[PDB]
Structure formats: structure tokens, C-alpha cells
Amino acid sequence: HTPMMQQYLRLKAQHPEILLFYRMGDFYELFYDDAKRASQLLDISLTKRGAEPIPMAGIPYHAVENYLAKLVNQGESVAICEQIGVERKVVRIVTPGTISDEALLQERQDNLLAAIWQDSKGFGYATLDISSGRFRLSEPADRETMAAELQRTNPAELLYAEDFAEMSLIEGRRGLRRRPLWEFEIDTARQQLNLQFGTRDLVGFGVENAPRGLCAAGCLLQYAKDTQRTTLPHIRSITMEREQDSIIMDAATRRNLEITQNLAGGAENTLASVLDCTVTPMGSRMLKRWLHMPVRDTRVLLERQQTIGALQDFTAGLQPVLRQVGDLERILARLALRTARPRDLARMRHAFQQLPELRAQLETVDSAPVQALREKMGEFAELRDLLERAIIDTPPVLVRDGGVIASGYNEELDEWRALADGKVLTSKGKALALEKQLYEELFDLLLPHLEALQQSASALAELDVLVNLAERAYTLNYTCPTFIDKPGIRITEGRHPVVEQVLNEPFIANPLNLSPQRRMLIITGPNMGGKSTYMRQTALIALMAYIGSYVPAQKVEIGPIDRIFTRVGAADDLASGRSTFMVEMTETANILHNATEYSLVLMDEIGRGTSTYDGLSLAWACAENLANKIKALTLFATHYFELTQLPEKMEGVANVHLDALEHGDTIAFMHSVQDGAASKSYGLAVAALAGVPKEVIKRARQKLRELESIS
Amino acid sequence: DNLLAAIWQDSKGFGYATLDISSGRFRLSEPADRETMAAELQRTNPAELLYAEDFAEMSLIEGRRGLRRRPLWEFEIDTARQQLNLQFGTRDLVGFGVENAPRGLCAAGCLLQYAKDTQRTTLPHIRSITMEREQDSIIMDAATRRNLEITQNLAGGAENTLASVLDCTVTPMGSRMLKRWLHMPVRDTRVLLERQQTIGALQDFTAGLQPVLRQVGDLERILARLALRTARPRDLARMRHAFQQLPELRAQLETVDSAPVQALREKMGEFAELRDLLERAIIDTPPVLVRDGGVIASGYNEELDEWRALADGDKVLTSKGKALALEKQLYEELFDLLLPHLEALQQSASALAELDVLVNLAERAYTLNYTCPTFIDKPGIRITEGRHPVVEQVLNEPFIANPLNLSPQRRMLIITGPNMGGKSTYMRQTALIALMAYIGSYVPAQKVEIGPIDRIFTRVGAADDLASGRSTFMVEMTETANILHNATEYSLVLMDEIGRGTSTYDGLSLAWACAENLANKIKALTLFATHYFELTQLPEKMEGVANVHLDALEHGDTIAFMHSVQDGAASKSYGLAVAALAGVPKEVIKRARQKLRELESI
Numbered sequence A: 001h002t003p004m005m006q007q008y009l010r011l012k013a014q015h016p017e018i019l020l021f022y023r024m025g026d027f028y029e030l031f032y033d034d035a036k037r038a039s040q041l042l043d044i045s046l047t048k049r050g051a052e053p054i055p056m057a058g059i060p061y062h063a064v065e066n067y068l069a070k071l072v073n074q075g076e077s078v079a080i081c082e083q084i085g086v087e088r089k090v091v092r093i094v095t096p097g098t099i100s101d102e103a104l105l106q107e108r109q110d111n112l113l114a115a116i117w118q119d120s121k122g123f124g125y126a127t128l129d130i131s132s133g134r135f136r137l138s139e140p141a142d143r144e145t146m147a148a149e150l151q152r153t154n155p156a157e158l159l160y161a162e163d164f165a166e167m168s169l170i171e172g173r174r175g176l177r178r179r180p181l182w183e184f185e186i187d188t189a190r191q192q193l194n195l196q197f198g199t200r201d202l203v204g205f206g207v208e209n210a211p212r213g214l215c216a217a218g219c220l221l222q223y224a225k226d227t228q229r230t231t232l233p234h235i236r237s238i239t240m241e242r243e244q245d246s247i248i249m250d251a252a253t254r255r256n257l258e259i260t261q262n263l264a265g266g267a268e269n270t271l272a273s274v275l276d277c278t279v280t281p282m283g284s285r286m287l288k289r290w291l292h293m294p295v296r297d298t299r300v301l302l303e304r305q306q307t308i309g310a311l312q313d314f315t316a317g318l319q320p321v322l323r324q325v326g327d328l329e330r331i332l333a334r335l336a337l338r339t340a341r342p343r344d345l346a347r348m349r350h351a352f353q354q355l356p357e358l359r360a361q362l363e364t365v366d367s368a369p370v371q372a373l374r375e376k377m378g379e380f381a382e383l384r385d386l387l388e389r390a391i392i393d394t395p396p397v398l399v400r401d402g403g404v405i406a407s408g409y410n411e412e413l414d415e416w417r418a419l420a421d422g423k424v425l426t427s428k429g430k431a432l433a434l435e436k437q438l439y440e441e442l443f444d445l446l447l448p449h450l451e452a453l454q455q456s457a458s459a460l461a462e463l464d465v466l467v468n469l470a471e472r473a474y475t476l477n478y479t480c481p482t483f484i485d486k487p488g489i490r491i492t493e494g495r496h497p498v499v500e501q502v503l504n505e506p507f508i509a510n511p512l513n514l515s516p517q518r519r520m521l522i523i524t525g526p527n528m529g530g531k532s533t534y535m536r537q538t539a540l541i542a543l544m545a546y547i548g549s550y551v552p553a554q555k556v557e558i559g560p561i562d563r564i565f566t567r568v569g570a571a572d573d574l575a576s577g578r579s580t581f582m583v584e585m586t587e588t589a590n591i592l593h594n595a596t597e598y599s600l601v602l603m604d605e606i607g608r609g610t611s612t613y614d615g616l617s618l619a620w621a622c623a624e625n626l627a628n629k630i631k632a633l634t635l636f637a638t639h640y641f642e643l644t645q646l647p648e649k650m651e652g653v654a655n656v657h658l659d660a661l662e663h664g665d666t667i668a669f670m671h672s673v674q675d676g677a678a679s680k681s682y683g684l685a686v687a688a689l690a691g692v693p694k695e696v697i698k699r700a701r702q703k704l705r706e707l708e709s710i711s
Numbered sequence B: 001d002n003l004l005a006a007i008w009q010d011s012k013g014f015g016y017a018t019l020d021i022s023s024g025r026f027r028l029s030e031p032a033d034r035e036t037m038a039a040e041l042q043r044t045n046p047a048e049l050l051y052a053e054d055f056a057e058m059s060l061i062e063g064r065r066g067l068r069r070r071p072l073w074e075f076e077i078d079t080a081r082q083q084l085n086l087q088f089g090t091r092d093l094v095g096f097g098v099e100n101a102p103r104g105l106c107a108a109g110c111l112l113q114y115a116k117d118t119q120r121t122t123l124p125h126i127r128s129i130t131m132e133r134e135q136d137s138i139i140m141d142a143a144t145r146r147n148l149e150i151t152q153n154l155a156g157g158a159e160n161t162l163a164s165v166l167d168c169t170v171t172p173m174g175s176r177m178l179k180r181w182l183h184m185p186v187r188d189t190r191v192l193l194e195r196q197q198t199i200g201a202l203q204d205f206t207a208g209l210q211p212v213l214r215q216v217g218d219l220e221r222i223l224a225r226l227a228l229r230t231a232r233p234r235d236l237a238r239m240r241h242a243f244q245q246l247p248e249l250r251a252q253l254e255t256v257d258s259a260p261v262q263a264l265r266e267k268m269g270e271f272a273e274l275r276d277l278l279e280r281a282i283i284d285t286p287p288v289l290v291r292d293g294g295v296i297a298s299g300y301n302e303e304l305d306e307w308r309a310l311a312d313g314d315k316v317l318t319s320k321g322k323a324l325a326l327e328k329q330l331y332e333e334l335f336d337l338l339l340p341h342l343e344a345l346q347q348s349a350s351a352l353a354e355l356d357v358l359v360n361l362a363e364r365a366y367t368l369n370y371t372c373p374t375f376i377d378k379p380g381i382r383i384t385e386g387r388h389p390v391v392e393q394v395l396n397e398p399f400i401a402n403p404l405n406l407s408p409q410r411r412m413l414i415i416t417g418p419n420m421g422g423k424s425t426y427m428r429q430t431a432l433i434a435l436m437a438y439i440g441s442y443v444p445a446q447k448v449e450i451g452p453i454d455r456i457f458t459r460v461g462a463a464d465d466l467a468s469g470r471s472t473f474m475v476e477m478t479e480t481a482n483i484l485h486n487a488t489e490y491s492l493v494l495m496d497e498i499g500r501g502t503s504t505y506d507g508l509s510l511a512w513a514c515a516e517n518l519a520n521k522i523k524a525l526t527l528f529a530t531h532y533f534e535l536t537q538l539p540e541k542m543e544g545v546a547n548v549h550l551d552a553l554e555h556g557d558t559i560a561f562m563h564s565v566q567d568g569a570a571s572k573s574y575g576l577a578v579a580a581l582a583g584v585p586k587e588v589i590k591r592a593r594q595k596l597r598e599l600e601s602i
Ligand SMILES: Nc1ncnc2c1ncn2[C@@H]1O[C@H](COP(=O)(O)OP(=O)(O)O)[C@@H](O)[C@H]1O
Pocket: A499, A503, A505, A506, A507, A508, A509, A510, A525, A526, A527, A528, A529, A530, A531, A532, A533, A534, A671, A672, B464, B466, B467, B468, B469, B470, B471, B472, B473
């Protein structure tokens, strides 16, 4: 009704489904439906004011960042409106996918805005990180491949077309946003993408012949430009990810091998925890990204191994210098969006001061990869000179506070400030205005070098990951792997990376040889004898070899690995309609349909969850199909000793057995892999060690004698 | 009594241990209150006691039978854990369920050494160490809560959980109370009977009460802020709105004639004097912060009204400053008047939350066809036309209700059935129905008679923590050991398969012995799901054990599952047919059937 209410309503019409922090006075406020939703999510009191009461809720302007964090975590998008001239407009829209602020973001985790589009011929997925600037395009052609991409990327906000047919993988995701179908058109996407990259055609990127992916990227770029309400100079490339480029891992294999998250859900006791001691946050995020998507390009891996070897001697000197550089990638993003704070520019100055030390240390070491990283990082002599002169040694958190500009950067600014300290209100007001204007000019001077600075941030992060891997290799005794043309895995004195560090008792290393001649190894062993660790050590060694890192073994020769499949454990989803056998069988079906000669298949106790005869029969058929028709390199762990006779019937299958010694009705585990087979599982002994009551174990032993006597 | 005891004190709390010479019963406790430790010392009434030389409070054990003192080195945790592990022949004590009690284990280590010294005859008769708890709440382990999906699903998501089905509470305080009730289900019949009477009584008027309850909002946070005197001006206005709402709720509840409903009405209160103070002292729409001013309303203070007049038609600016200072002092004075009644207000916020949870439960019951459960003295569960609360809501197809009867006469049922038959859903439906009955809610069944349940044990998952040092069979055997050691006649033990990790003969042997022990000695109410059809021959050999078979019909390649519980053994599980439905390639299914024919033929 009132003119003020009419203005809020016009802006609300422009942004209907998002909470609007309309700025009245010094307090941001929400009205009508937004006020009720905000009060429940932000825990702020709701007070109704008559114009027809209008529900109104409010937060102080000083505390806005703390409140924005609560809504961003809940996945709500909050548009912030400020009075520019009272004339007002939405200055920025804060959404879980595109947050570049330090408080809203997490230091060692990346927030990715992603787009899913389903055309009749397969799916197209595009992911953009606003802070790093990385734009990646993909064309998954199966529901299973699309689900793996969503789980691996873990998109903070996913933009799906209204007509998306398979709203099952999408449903339950965080920050789902329905977007109109018009936004996904290919011709509109091509024109917008070409303008941002400044290229007439996308042939140089190599994304020109992918139609579905380009449609998703056009929606993602348009939403990102609208959400930030400014041109995004940080985004300058659209690389395309292909299945051939990286080893494929399904969502289950990633969780079973504990690459970044343990089976319970914590980050403790994970391969990333053992390998990640990186000094800078950029390094931690980059190492996690490499472990999730290993590279199958030999040239990229060989350069990474050569850098690790060259810097291994000088790691102790480089790590303290790298720690000072800090998270340059995030700081450059704020500079690109022109939203940086004085402290961020001081951190940028500190990193530039460290660059001369890093360049000198890298110059002494002689290797083609290390010299290329040294050339890319650069010196930035001009920028460090400007930052040191323009900004004070310890600047305030916010520009409005004042004191951001050091004396002597501008004679006029110093004179106005001196007059006020020595009309005083006029001089203070003029000084605050001039200091703000000079700060904007500093962004303009730093921005033309953004292309070089972004290249330097990637080089420094790469050096941090490679130096960390080199330091880890020296401390944990890892050695470099070598690559072979035909599919095979040969490991000497291999040890599981995580178990070796966590277990106080000495790890007993084991050898593995898998070749086209010996495609499958059936591991039969005493319970608690180490079979699962032996199988998982092979996958973790193979993943570590293909991320360019040194492997935890005396020597490893690894041939091409297209995909790694792990069937481990059993789980029930009663609400989804999936029984424990159904969940296991769909995973087994995925291995049988999608496996290739290059792929490595690790299967643990397949055929359990059903009667013994049905389980053994399905296990024999699945083993015969994998060894005879798929011809994949596979490791099968089984307590069904009937399957031990497969090698005699079929060539290309061998039996390996872990062994344990039984003493005085107690079990001692050698944990050593010896060729042959084991006919005893020692189940009652493991149960007694677990704490099953002695009376129960004695009756069980009596029953076992009776059952064995019957046959 | 023949009881040797030990006591310990530290910054974390107090630890205690008990050993009975006659029965070889070794138990530990960690009572964290001095008064609780004093009550425990009297309840145990130990023949002999051992305490730390530097125990801080000797008054708890100042006068005791044969009181003795032993050195600190005997009480050290690392030495104690190794000795206890060696005495029981176990790698870890996680299976006994006492691994996570540091103080309790430390006292137990001193008692074990002393017991060996006093008699070596009792030492071979000590085989277990269990915690002692007669807590009113039904005991549920962390694994049981996640397996039953009481509040959090196995993936970690909020959806597809029992709390999601029942959590439609209007106010945020109500949602917290329901989640707290689900985690601790009260076992005392009197409190539950009062809650059930309220749910039935307020069933007719749920639509009238819920809109008024929604207006009250969350008062727990506002009252906590008032206690720290950090309450915002708007938060005090929110309290005033709830005071205005309370007369309406009381009038609606006055027509109802149930003793529990009337008690809840009295606890809510009217707070007319507090409402009068807030209405007179605070403006209708107060500012977010008290610093700006305008929070106090004219007429609360005569001096402020006069200063406000002078402020608004440089000396005038000084008068404006005086007005802001007078207003802030009045605001602090307002907290002082409200705080004496803060204990009374806290009782009222709890009463309003209980009304919201019970009105919500009543609405859920009418919408979802739930019925009241009748408590019985002896330990038994009887369910007629029972349904699973979560599965029925998320399943588009109809749910097939299955009957359950468990008594001391028929304590154990071996459920055997086809894969995807519904055996696990049937076992869980019993657990969620028992928990729903014990929180005072209406159970999802036509009729339920639930007897006392001490603890609910669920052994379903099979996972390995390699870094921890336990394989999948050790993790499963650790859970089975906790079931056998900590089970009681009252406990409800649901076991989804055992021996799924070891070879068929070792697994069947452990399953036969664990099943015999639970029926013959523990005498717990057990539901056992199994694919070993050898165990279906256990019911004739052992009393209290019966067979329940789920039904399926096979036509050609596909299978249809009845989801109906009938008495019998099944004897066939259609694993290959379920694999074909899962999508295993036809050639793999064809080879599997050929091998199956050869295995059975020989
Ligand atoms: N070679 C080894 N040296 C030392 N410890 C080992 C070795 N192999 C396995 N272990 C230990 O065995 C446990 C895991 O055994 P696992 O392979 O899961 O057994 P299973 O699958 O037979 O039950 C962990 O304690 C792990 O540290």
C-alpha cells in the first residue's frame, strides 16, 4: 500500500522464489512470505507491522555475513538489495554454488555450481567453480555415468531443466534449482560462451563438437553472470572432460577405497589424510581433486614423477616458503569480481614477497618440469611494489574503517588527513572519500595482470602438492612406478598406504602379479588374515601411480587401467525398495555389463546374502564370465573353497592364499601371500578373539565336528 | 553378598567396579554425580572396597565394610586394559560393551588384580565385564539407532526416517522434543499412559489447537536469551504474542475432560501480569536492537515521556541523549521483573512443546490409521495387521500387513523366506512399533500388546574398519558378542543373519550355538532372519523356538512375492530369480542355473 512497500513489491516480482534482504536504514529486513521463511532458518524473531499485517523480520547490517552463512549452508539463495541512489537494485545474489566470500566458503573444500541437461541422445553436465575459475564440460551417456559424475563433483547448487526426464539421481541433491527450458538452447549457449572466452569458435578449447555439454554450459555461464551481477574475467577456458582421459570410478568404489571420506563419514583414516600434509589450502583442494580423477595420459604423469624426484632433496626449504603464500586462488577471484577486502590485498602482497625466494630455490634444481613451474610462477615485481607503497602493513578488515591507504601513495590524501588531525569534519569526510577512490584504482592496476596471476596461483598450488608428495615419499619410503603398454599390475613388497601408518604393529608387505596370462587371482584365507587389505592395497597403489605420486612398494609396473570396480560389503535401503541382495546384485551387474579388458575388478565375498548353493552357482558364473569373456584383470576374495577348483577347469585363473598358524586353540596371522589355496577359514577362532562367550564357541565347535562328520 | 568393589575419582567423573565371588559377575559403572556415587555405594553395599590413596572425597566411602586402600599404579588405565583383555582372551573389549568407559575400566583393573590375590579359584570363572544400567529409557546402542533409522538414515540424510514420518510439529520446540522422545523412550508405564490419554483426548480438536500453537512459536530460545539478559527487543515482543495466545489455548483445552490434558493446561499458565508489563512497556513493532532506541513505549515511565517531548518538538541533542540513557535503564529493569518468573516460564514453554508434540502425534494417527498400544506385565509382543511406519509412506504399491506373536512360551522365531521377500522389513516393523509404543505414540498396527523391553539390539550391517583393526567378520562377531553378553529376559534382539562372512559350516555352527543360547539361557525375545535352511530344524530340538516363513510364487523367469507371514520353513530362496531382476546378464543367469542343477544333483 505505502510507496516504500510498493518498491519492495516491484523488486520481489523480479526475484520471486529467493529471500530478499531489502536494506532499510542500517538493518537488512525481509517482508511477507520471505520474513516467515527467514525467521525459521536464521532463528530471528518475526514482528508484524500493519500497512493486512505485513510479517517483517530483520538482521543488523554489521552481522549480515554471519546470517548469510546460515542460509547458504541450508541451500537458500538470498538476494541482497542496497540503495545505490530511494533508488535501489539487487547488488548481488548469494547462492550456495557461487559464494566467493571467506566466511561463507570452506577453506579446504570447493563449491561447484553445476548444470544437468538431458537431450534424447544422452546427458550433458557442465561445472564451474566461481573462485578458481575452472569451467569443465562433460557428456555422460548413461544414467550410471551421470550418477558417478554428480557424486564425484558433489555440486553445491545443481541447475536442472524443468523437463529433465530422470528426476531420480537429481532428487535429494543439495541446492537443486529448476531453470526454464529456454535457457538450455544450443544457439544461445554458443553465442554467450564465445563472448566470455573472446574466441570466434570453440575449436581451440576442443568443445566445439559436443552439443549437449555446450547447452548446459550456456545455462551455467548465464546464471553465474546474473548471480554475481558483473562480468566474470576469471572464466577464460572451457576444457572438456572425456572418459578416456581419467580412470573411471563409480560412487561405491570411491567410498569403499576411502579416498577422501571414511565409510562412517569422517575425514579421519582416509588416503587423503595420509597423503595430504600440504602447507597451502590451494594444495589441499588440488590434491583432493587429483585423487578423485586420476589421469590416464602418460606424458602428464611422467612430468609429475620427475618433479617429485627433482624437489625431494629441497622439500624442507620449499615448505616454509610455500606456507607463507597461502590461498592465492581465492584472493585473485575476489580481485576479479572487484569484491576484495583490504586484508586480502595484504595477503597478496605477502605472497609476492615470497616469490623471489621460491624462484631462487627452484632455479638451482635442474629438470624440465621444475623449470617450467618456475617460469609460470613469475616474480610480479611491479605488483609487489604497488601493494607495498599503497597499503599499510596491517590493514583494517573493511575499507570504510579507513587507514587502508599508507601515507605517500597520494600526496593530496595525506594532506587532507593531516589537516583533519591538525573544517575537521570536512577534511575527515574528504579523506574517507579519497581513500575509497584510491582503493578502487588499485583494483584497476592489479586486474590487467589477472591472466598471469591466475597462471601463477595454479603453478604455486601444483608445487605445493608435488613438494608435499615428495616430502611424504621420503618419510613413508614410497618409490616411483613405471608404465607398460599392455594391461598388467606387477607389485613388489606392496603395503596398504592408510593401514601401514595407523597400525602400530609392523605391516607385512605382499607381492602381486596380474598379467593377460594370469588375469584372475582367487584369494582364499583365514578370516582376519588380510585378504581385503591385499585387494585394496592393489587399488590404492594403482590410483596413487596414476595421480603421478610415488607408490608405497619397492617396485611397481602398472599397465593401462580403464576403470576400477570394487564390490565390498552389503547394505539395505528399505525405503528405496532395495534389499541387501538386490544392492549387491546391481553392483555385480554393473561390473559384468561395464567391465573391459583394461579395467581392474576387485570383488569381496560375492554370492553372500543368499543360500550357499545359489551363492556359489552365481559366483562361479560371474567368475567364469569375468575371466573367459570380459578378460578383465580381477582379484576375487572367497570363503567358498569350492571356487578354488576354477583354475584347473579354466586357464588364466590362479589361486593365492594368505595363511595363519593355529596354536593352543588361538590364531596367529602371518599376513603373507603365498601361491596355493587355504581349506580352513578359522571362523570359530576369530569369534573367540572377538569376545563371543566361551560356552557358545564350545557348542559351535561340537556342531562343526558333527557337520564335517556328516559329509 | 560376597562382593568385592573398587572406586575411582578424576576430573572427568567417578568410576566404579563390582565383582561377585559366588557368580563370577564382573560389572563396571561411571556415575558422574557425587550423590549418585553415594546412592550406588549403598545400593551395591559391597563386602570390601578398594579406593585410590589420593581419592578426593572419602566421605562417600567414609564408613564401609572392610574398606581398604591400594596404590595408584594398580588403577592405571593402560595396564588395566591389557590385563582385562588377557584374562578374557579378547583382542579388544568393544564386544563386552565396556571399551568406551575409561574410568570404569580403571577401577575394574584394580579389582581384577585384588581378586586374583584374594582367591585364584574365582579367576577362571570370570568371563565377562558389562556396564550396569537400570535407566528408565530403553537402552539402544548407537548402531541400533542408525540401523532402525530413528532420526538419521544409513546414508546420513534426514529423509526416509521414523522422525520424518512423525515430525509435522507446528513449532520448532515441538520438533526438538519429538526427536528427544524418539532417542530416549521412557519405560515407565505411568508417563506413557498419560501421554496416550492426551493423544486420544485431543484427537477431535487437533485442527483448532494447531493454528494457535503455531502462533506461539519457539519460546525455548527466547527464554534462554532472557536468562543471559541478551534478549532482543523483538524477542520480548514475541514472548508478549505467546502470552496473548495462551488464554485461547486454555479455553479450548478446558472443554476436554482428561486429567493429563488438565494438568498440561495448568502448567501452561496465563502470565497476565507479565503480559501487562510487556504490553505497556514495549511498542507494537520494536526495533531489532535496543541501542537505537524507541523500544520503550510511552506511559511506562513519566520522566522518559517528558524527556522524549523535549527531544522532539544542541541543548535539545543533550536531552535526546538523556532520553536514550533513561530508556536503556528501563529496559534492563524490564528483564529484572521478568526473571523471577523465569523458572515458571520454562515450565510453560515445556508444557506448550508437549501439547504441540501430542497434538502432532494425534493428527499423524488420524491421517495414518494408527491405534493405541496396551501395556502388559510379562515380557511379550503381540501385533495384529502390523505395518512398517516409514516403508508404507514411501511405497506407492500397497503394504501387506503381517501379524507377530512373541511370548515366553514362543520366544524365538526363525524367519526364513525368498530374497526380497520382506524378512528384514518384518523384523524392523517389530522394533519401530515397540519404540513408537514406548514414546507414548499410537503404534502403526490394528492392535498391539507390548510387554516390558529392557533394550533393543539390532545386528544387520556387515562392514570392516581396516584402520581400526577389525575385519567384517570381527565387526559382526563383536555385535553378536554384545547381544549374548548384555542381553536380558526382557530384551528384544533382532539378528539379520550370522556367519555371512565365514565358510558355510563355521557360519552355521555359530548360528546354531548363538540361536540355542538366546532361546535356552538368555531367554530374550528374538527374531532371526536366515538363508541357512539347516537352522529351520532347530525348533523341534529346542523349546520356545518356532519357524515363520515368508511366501513367494515362481512363474517362468520372473518371481512375485506375497509379503505374507505364514508358519513353515520355506526351504527355497529364489536368489537367481532376484539376480535376474537386479539386471545380471541373461548368459550369467543361464550358466548359474546349470551349475545349480549339478550341485544339487550330486
Ligand atoms: N601384511 C600385513 N601386515 C600387517 N598387518 C596386516 C597385513 N595384512 C593385513 N593386516 C591387518 O589385518 C587387518 C585387516 O585384515 P583384512 O584383510 O580385513 O582381513 P579379512 O578380510 O581376512 O578379514 C588390519 O588389522 C590390518 O592392519
